[PDB]
């Protein structure tokens, strides 16, 4: 552990500075160090962890998509042979992306999920597990693709089951989980009808619970509800 000699509180402080400086690789390294201290994470600290890795992997995914498109065009009829370089570089980026996903999944497995007993923490981590398996699935083409997809599905499903039992329909973690599981259905599992049904049912059940909320909670929940609506508009 490169961060083994730094205090937990200093790692957290520096993660916050790295976020302000848009240094997301540093932010992720600091938060990995904080997790490896072995203590549970607070709400704020869980969000630092997720933001850091979301931004790192988000950049890798965007780059992978650019390179994959170039590679696809190189393999069309009439395209002039340019050698192994496009495939090699796409593979380089892909391997880096898989490494980041494996790092996150490793933190969740050792030992964030097993120590998370409150619904808010457990659902948060299980959503992350689904998300990072989904990112692995986006680039998977081999013998294990089905198993990767099923790992994502299983994590999301456990998170959904807990969220429906333990959280109100407007809870932002519940809403974001459903948003992302809906995308999993549409983009990964070839299940657009399931995707649409989940987004609709989630939106409508949240709408019906908004009356219970403060102004500030209302703002939070309605922001995520609009993302559900945006996806529904894209898909219908």
């Amino acid at each position: 552990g490169a961060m083994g000699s730094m205090e937990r509180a200093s790692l957290i402080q520096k993660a916050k500075l790295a976020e302000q400086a848009e240094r997301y690789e540093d932010m992720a390294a600091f938060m990995k160090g904080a997790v490896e201290k072995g203590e549970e994470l607070s709400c704020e600290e869980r969000n630092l962890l997720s933001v850091a890795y979301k931004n790192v992997v988000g950049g890798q995914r965007a780059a992978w998509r650019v390179l994959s498109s170039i590679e696809q065009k190189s393999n069309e009829e009439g395209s002039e042979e340019k050698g192994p370089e496009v495939r090699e570089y796409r593979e380089k980026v892909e391997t880096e992306l898989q490494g980041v996903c494996d790092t996150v999944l490793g933190l969740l497995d050792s030992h964030l999920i097993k120590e998370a007993g409150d619904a808010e923490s457990r659902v948060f981590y299980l959503k992350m597990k689904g998300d990072y398996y989904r990112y692995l699935a986006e680039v998977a083409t081999g013998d294990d693709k089905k198993r990767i997809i099923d790992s994502a599905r299983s994590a999301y499903q456990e998170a959904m089951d807990i969220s429906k039992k333990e959280m109100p329909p407007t809870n932002p973690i519940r809403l974001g989980l459903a948003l992302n599981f809906s995308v999993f259905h549409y983009e990964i599992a070839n299940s657009p009808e399931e995707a649409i049904s989940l987004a609709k049912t989630t939106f409508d059940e949240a709408m019906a619970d908004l009356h219970t909320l403060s102004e500030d909670s209302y703002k939070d929940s309605t922001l995520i509800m609009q993302l559900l609506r945006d996806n529904l508009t894209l898909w219908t």
């Binding site: 948003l179 992302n180 995308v183 549409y186 995520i224 945006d230 898909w235």
Partner: peptide, 5 residues
């Protein structure tokens, strides 16, 4: 691409 959080 669709929205995720």
């Amino acid at each position: 691409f669709p929205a995720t959080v």
